Write a protein that binds this DNA or RNA. Structure first.
Ligand SMILES: [Mg+2]
Ligand SMILES: [Mg+2]
Ligand SMILES: [Mg+2]
Ligand SMILES: [Mg+2]
Ligand SMILES: [Mg+2]
Ligand SMILES: [Mg+2]
Ligand SMILES: [Mg+2]
Ligand SMILES: [Mg+2]
Ligand SMILES: [Mg+2]
Ligand SMILES: [Mg+2]
Ligand SMILES: [Mg+2]
Ligand SMILES: [Mg+2]
Ligand SMILES: [Mg+2]
Ligand SMILES: [Mg+2]
Ligand SMILES: [Mg+2]
Ligand SMILES: [Mg+2]
Ligand SMILES: [Mg+2]
Ligand SMILES: [Mg+2]
Ligand SMILES: [Mg+2]
Ligand SMILES: [Mg+2]
Ligand SMILES: [Mg+2]
Ligand SMILES: [Mg+2]
Ligand SMILES: [Mg+2]
Ligand SMILES: [Mg+2]
Ligand SMILES: [Mg+2]
Lengths: 252, 233, 56, 68, 121
RNA sequence: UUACUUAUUCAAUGAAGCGGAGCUGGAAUUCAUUUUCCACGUUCUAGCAUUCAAGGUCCCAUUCGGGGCUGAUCCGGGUUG
RNA sequence: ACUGUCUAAUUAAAACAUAGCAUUGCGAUGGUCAGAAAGUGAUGUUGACGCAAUGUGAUUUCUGCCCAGUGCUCUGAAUGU
């Protein structure tokens, strides 16, 4: 039979990201002298819409400490930051929405976005519109910090790892119904070519494990093992449970 | 003073672009540099076996300079001095009928690796000099043990190239003396004594000691001050 | 159009005030007042913490 | 001559002195290019008996190849 | 003493001495003679009726000219071979794969005269 | 089982301020004197910050120009994790 | 449900898609996928209001009982293989 749809995506032909209009990668400043000893000041020169993104970017310019020139950065904008505002980044820096501080330097309950996984990676976690992470504790010996990510997971990372105070802007985007095919259409038009989706059960056997039969139906359990091999994994992969989730979610 | 003014500058993080400083410690070197340095380090970090590392114990600059002083009187013929000697004994021998000697028995430092080895084997060497560099180290490493067994006093000396200059080669792995003019015999015995004292006597004990296992200083001070506080509070 | 600016005389490309062909007057007005007052308060900032060090 | 000594020493690979040498050298090589010119043989006795000579026109190259 | 002082973190390829070539033997052993001369630039007159008209009414000489030659090479060669001042030279490629030069002379010279001096009519 | 870092692995940077010590402060209470631990140029403002830095000092034989040191503390060349 | 889509050249449909609804995997030393291999590649100019994988099919209403079997899954067991 045929190579199924989820196998063809990895070869990246018609499936690569539609990148032309994007403002450029959002990152924190490089972690340098200023940021790990002192603080350094910047101005948000603009806050701007990035294509295929939920949340606005903020263009933030700084002075180059080692050379006379301006150096401009692209930040994900936290809700409430504004044009003309001064941004402070460094180990010793006041605790205010929009500033970037090492996770060690903020008290528990602090709310931060675009937080680094390792120190220096210029931010990894909690970048999507509406999201943040909460600092749930410190271990000053071995200087770690325990945080809770948007997924509900709780991870422990270096207290040197930087984050930015506040939550990411443009929240509530997903509360509004798309209402029609076209709105979805233009949505994925600026992301990648994932839409619309043919059901495997509407296909012929060559095309898909679910394909075929004189009635539409899966024909065997749609829960597939991790051990499964490419061309086998479609449906519910490695599911530990299945069915309507009753009762409260929200991990203890 | 008069129209002149005292400005000065605040280099303090967030003002006044940094001055040009010396970044030499930070420059990004070419790989060939990066390696010959890291190779030097890796050799120190590793525990190094006593059959190597019996090198690195190298003749002091004083005893050595006295040794070069003596050896330099014994240099091999220069190109000119042989051409010169030939014409002397090309004429005098072939005509004046001295049998292959219009020339005196030469006295010179002996060299080349295979040459010197067989000299040590044959117990003809009074003194053997061994270089400390010699990158395919195997060419050399068996020599102290060979010398020690043959009762031939030896010294490990810095300057594979400095051994070279005294023989008129770019470099030489070894340099040895066998013959000596009776005038120099006593200076030699004196050198042989100091040398034997620093090498051939210490051989057995050196043979028991591994080298290396040495930390860099960022790692040093970390454990110098960690074992400092932990035990004594 | 951009390359025609090379075919014209300099008076068409400027106005006589500082930051002439660049910034918008009222904007220059602001960076004057701002510069001045900040350079002033910068004196006010030093002598106050000059006393703070001396009385504390 | 020295070459005979090199020959015998090289037959003790697991001897402490060669284990050291093997370890330092293998790191250096792996740092250089997969094919790189060698200044001189690092086994002068081995090269020798394979037909090497110290005259101009003889050349040594060092090279890496993947195993398995 | 102490080390060099470099104020920059980048190491660059040392600027080293480039020697000019000093051959031990000559390149080609004889230099090629001029590959396009005035005799090879302008090939024949073009005597077609509509061309002869440009000569009478236009003060213009029409030549079949080397495909390898430009307006400079054409102007100069007409100048040297015919002892004439050239106003301007227009060219085009005929569709048999040959090049045609429309050569207008200056008001001092009469193309018609110069045309039956070279001997065609 | 848990420590080490040089093999191997990962990230960063036009390999820029690492590690160790010293200056001055000061919380700190002295059980002889310091036993230590923090620090040790930037936060009302949508300005300005570049010519090896002005200053100070020593030179060239006083030219116009130009150099050294200090300003900017020492030490180890492990680019930082 | 709607607008929309397909069997160029016998089927335009009740088939496919769609919004909505639900389930599944994954915190990057990762999930899904590519490649003979690799200091290789898609998602990714990305980070759970995300990417990837299935099902049902607008709204309203409602989605009962069964985990023995086949799957999938597990901070479980242990003296059988
Ligand atoms: Mg792309
Ligand atoms: Mg599509
Ligand atoms: Mg679907
Ligand atoms: Mg569908
Ligand atoms: Mg079908
Ligand atoms: Mg199948
Ligand atoms: Mg199946
Ligand atoms: Mg089926
Ligand atoms: Mg069905
Ligand atoms: Mg004007
Ligand atoms: Mg002016
Ligand atoms: Mg050579
Ligand atoms: Mg034309
Ligand atoms: Mg760096
Ligand atoms: Mg219709
Ligand atoms: Mg049809
Ligand atoms: Mg129809
Ligand atoms: Mg039809
Ligand atoms: Mg419904
Ligand atoms: Mg590889
Ligand atoms: Mg349908
Ligand atoms: Mg759907
Ligand atoms: Mg009921
Ligand atoms: Mg019942
Ligand atoms: Mg069941």
């Amino acid at each position: 039979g045929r190579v199924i749809r989820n196998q063809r995506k990895g070869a990246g032909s018609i499936f690569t990201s539609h990148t032309r209009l994007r403002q450029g990668a959002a990152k924190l400043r490089t972690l340098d002298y200023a940021e790990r000893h002192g603080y350094i000041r910047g101005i948000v020169k603009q806050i701007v819409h990035d294509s295929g993104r939920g949340a606005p970017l903020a263009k933030v310019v700084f002075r180059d400490p080692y050379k006379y020139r301006l150096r401009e950065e692209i930040f994900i904008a936290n809700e409430g930051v504004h044009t003309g505002q001064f941004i402070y980044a460094g180990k010793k820096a006041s605790l205010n929405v929009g500033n970037v501080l090492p996770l060690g330097s903020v008290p528990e309950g602090t709310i931060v976005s675009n937080v680094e996984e390792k120190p220096g990676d210029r931010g990894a976690l909690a970048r999507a519109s509406g999201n943040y992470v909460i600092i749930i504790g410190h271990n000053p010996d071995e200087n770690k910090t325990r945080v809770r990510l948007p997924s509900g997971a709780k991870k422990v990372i270096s207290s040197d790892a930087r984050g930015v105070i506040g939550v990411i802007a443009g929240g509530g985007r997903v509360d509004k119904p798309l209402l029609k095919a076209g709105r979805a259409f233009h949505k994925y038009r600026l992301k990648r070519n994932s839409w619309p989706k043919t059901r495997g059960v509407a296909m012929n056997p060559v095309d898909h494990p679910h394909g075929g039969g004189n009635h539409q139906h899966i024909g065997k359990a749609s829960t597939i093992s991790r051990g499964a091999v490419s061309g086998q994994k479609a449906g519910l992969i490695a599911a530990r449970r299945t069915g309507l989730l009753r009762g409260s979610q929200k991990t203890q | 003073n008069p129209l002149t003014h005292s400005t000065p500058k605040n280099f303090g993080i967030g003002q006044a672009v940094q001055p040009k400083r010396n970044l030499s410690r930070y420059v990004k070197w070419p790989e060939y540099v990066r390696v010959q340095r890291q190779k030097k380090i890796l050799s120190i970090r590793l525990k190094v076996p006593p059959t190597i590392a019996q090198f690195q114990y190298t003749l002091d600059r004083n005893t050595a300079a006295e040794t070069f002083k003596l050896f330099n009187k014994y240099r091999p013929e220069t190109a000119a001095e042989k051409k010169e000697r030939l014409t002397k004994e090309a004429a005098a021998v072939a005509e004046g009928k001295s049998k292959q000697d219009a020339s005196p028995k030469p006295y010179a430092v002996k060299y080349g690796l295979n040459h010197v080895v067989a000299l040590i084997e044959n117990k003809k060497a009074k003194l053997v000099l061994i270089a400390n560099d010699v990158d395919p180290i195997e060419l050399v490493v068996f020599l102290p043990a060979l010398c020690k067994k043959m009762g031939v006093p030896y010294a490990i000396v810095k300057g594979k190239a400095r051994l070279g200059t005294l023989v008129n080669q770019k470099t030489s792995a070894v340099a040895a003396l066998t013959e000596v003019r009776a005038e120099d015999e006593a200076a030699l015995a004196k050198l042989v004594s100091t040398i034997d004292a620093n090498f051939a006597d210490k051989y057995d004990e050196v043979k028991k000691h591994w080298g290396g296992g040495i930390l860099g200083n960022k790692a040093q001070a970390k454990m110098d001050k960690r074992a400092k506080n932990s035990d004594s509070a | 159009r951009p390359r025609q600016y090379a075919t014209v005389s300099k008076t068409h490309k400027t106005v006589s005030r500082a930051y002439g062909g660049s910034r918008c007057a009222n904007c220059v007005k602001e960076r004057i007042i701002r510069a001045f007052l900040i350079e002033e308060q910068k004196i006010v900032k030093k002598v106050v913490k000059e006393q703070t060090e001396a009385a504390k | 001559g020295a070459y005979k000594y090199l020959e015998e020493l090289q037959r003790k690979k697991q001897s402490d002195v060669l284990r050291f040498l093997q370890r330092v050298r293998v790191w250096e090589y792996r740092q250089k290019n997969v094919i790189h010119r060698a200044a001189r043989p690092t086994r002068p006795d081995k090269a020798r008996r394979l037909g090497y000579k110290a005259k101009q026109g003889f050349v040594i190259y060092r090279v890496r190849v993947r195993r398995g | 003493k102490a080390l060099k002082v470099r104020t920059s973190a980048t190491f660059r390829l040392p600027k080293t001495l480039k020697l000019a070539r000093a051959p031990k033997y000559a390149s080609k052993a004889v230099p090629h003679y001029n590959r396009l001369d005035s005799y090879k630039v302008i090939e024949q007159p073009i005597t077609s009726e509509t061309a002869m008209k440009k000569v009478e009414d236009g003060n213009i000489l029409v030549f079949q000219v080397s495909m390898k030659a430009n307006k400079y090479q054409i102007k100069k060669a007409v100048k040297e071979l015919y002892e004439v001042d050239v106003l301007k030279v227009n060219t085009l490629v005929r569709p048999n794969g040959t090049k045609k030069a429309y050569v207008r002379l200056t008001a001092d010279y009469d193309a018609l005269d110069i045309a039956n001096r070279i001997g065609y009519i």
